[PDB]
Each structure stands twice: as C-alpha cells, then as structure tokens.
Amino acid sequence: TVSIQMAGNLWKVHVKAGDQIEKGQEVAILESMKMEIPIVADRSGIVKEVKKKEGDFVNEGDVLLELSNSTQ
Numbered sequence: 001t002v003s004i005q006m007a008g009n010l011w012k013v014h015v016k017a018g019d020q021i022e023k024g025q026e027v028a029i030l031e032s033m034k035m036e037i038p039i040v041a042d043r044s045g046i047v048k049e050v051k052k053k054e055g056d057f058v059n060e061g062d063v064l065l066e067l068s069n070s071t072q
C-alpha cells in the first residue's frame with residue numbers, strides 16, 4: 001500500500017501490524033545519506049503489515065506498509 005519515495009535507510013518506524021494511521025500522520029522517517037525526510041501515511045487505514053523495520057535499507061518505490069482497508 002504505502003511505499004518509500006527516496007533512496008535511504010528507514011531511520012525510524014512509527015507503525016505496527018493492527019495499528020491505525022490517518023493520511024499525513026508520520027509512519028516512518030528516512031535518513032538519506034545524511035539528509036532527513038519524514039514519511040507520512042499516503043492514506044488512512046488499519047495497518048495489516050509493515051514491509052520494513054526501523055533501520056532497514058529502502059529506496060524509491062520500495063514497499064513500506066500494507067493496510068487492511070487497501071488489501072480487502
């Protein structure tokens with residue numbers, strides 16, 4: 001459902017399976033080779049699955065989150 005938008009490392013994560021998010025709420029943060037980019041929910045929903053973890057490597061179009069309302 002939600003995906004990373006820049007090359008980097010998933011500095012922090014703020015979602016869990018079964019958690020709730022709302023469009024524009026902070027769900028992760030990128031470090032990007034010493035740059036800083038908040039990662040916010042592309043759409044509201046209940047989280048079904050987190051496709052990465054805090055500290056994982058990530059890239060533009062790499063998966064981040066899967067939502068029950070979007071994986072019906």
Ligand SMILES: *C(=O)CCCC[C@@H]1SC[C@@H]2NC(=O)N[C@@H]21
Nearest residue numbers: 011030031032033034035036037
């Ligand atoms: C350089 O590679 C050393 C570690 C860089 C960590 C970076 S600096 C910008 C981001 N903010 C932060 O606290 N950590 C990330």
